[PDB]
Amino acid sequence: KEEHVIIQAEFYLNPDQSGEFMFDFDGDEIFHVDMAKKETVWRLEEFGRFASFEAQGALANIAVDKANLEIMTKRSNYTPITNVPPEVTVLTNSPVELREPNVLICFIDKFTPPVVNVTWLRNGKPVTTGVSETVFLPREDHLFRKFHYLPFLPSTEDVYDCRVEHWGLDEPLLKHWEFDA
Amino acid sequence: DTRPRFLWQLKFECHFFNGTERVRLLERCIYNQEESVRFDSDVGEYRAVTELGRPDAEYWNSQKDLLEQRRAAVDTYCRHNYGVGESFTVQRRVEPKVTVYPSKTQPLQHHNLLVCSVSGFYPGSIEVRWFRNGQEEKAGVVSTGLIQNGDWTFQTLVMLETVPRSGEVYTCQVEHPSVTSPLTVEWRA
Amino acid sequence: KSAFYILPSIISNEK
């Protein structure tokens, strides 16, 4: 029966002291608040042309959330979170064609706490040119998902890996992708 | 770094049914991975989901002005935001790019997986059908399902188990709210 | 350019 869902999703995490505030529409991020620069970051440019958002309120909410995390930590008898390692997948946004620009997507899914280290590797070497990432996105089961992006030129000579570190994995996870004729 | 972590999440979910005709506000508190307390606008007050949440659900239910502001939020908050974002979210439309290719370069008379790649579309509601020489083929369809790319696009791969013989023509037919006429792509054996 | 609105978070039972 559902048609649409808007979620105002917030979290705070100790002892990392990391906070997040975002709006979600049917699973996609409308915007989030950059905690450091204290400002709205729109997931797509045009959003910021059609809508606006006062960050001050989001920061105030985050402060209340930190206070509540400390209260709940005490109340639970200092029960820690159980680490849930991520599922990682690597896909292309479109069918691969040699010489036609494309994008690799690293899906990091179903994990908690929301702390990960994600690096792109081409032929074993870290690549940071043109890369991007989303913030943590909420899930109905209260785990998180994340996306990393790599624009690239398909070729038969290169291999790719998304390398994901998370406290739930006792070993760094490499997810592999290559164009195979 | 092995020291324990403690997580607090607060989610406000506005659920919309038949436009903005029916709206449900669901406020949810989560400690670690355990939802402790929630406000469901259909009930109109806080409820402890676990006993950990009982102190809050009691405290917050004693605040009449808080309960009033939450009860009215379906109007001042949910319906407001739906209106603010309607034009570029509910009404976002991006047409899918469709390609059809054999998953493997195999000669005729041997089993092959024919792939219909539908990429770059929005919203996620979509229907993909396979036809062999004009006849719809319902059996042997293998699909990745709907894939959310995280950048306000979706993709899906819908594969057909075939034994292609010479002369056969396979067609992938895609229906999507972004197109008035179904998109069709052919692959000739 | 209309503005998105937030619901305020509320302190928990400290007692």
Author numbering:
A (entry chain A): 2 to 182
B (entry chain B): 2 to 190
C (entry chain C): 1 to 15
From the article:
CD4+ T cells recognize a broad range of peptide epitopes of severe acute respiratory syndrome coronavirus 2 (SARS-CoV-2), which contribute to immune memory and limit COVID-19 disease. Analyzing six epitopes, some with very low binding affinity, we solve X-ray crystallographic structures of each bound to HLA-DR1. In summary, each peptide bound HLA-DR1 canonically in the “forward” orientation that is described for HLA-DR,48 excluding CLIP. We observed little deviation in the overall structure of HLA-DR1 irrespective of bound peptide, particularly within the peptide binding groove, where the solved diversity of bound peptides had little impact on the position of the HLA-DR1 residues that lined each pocket.
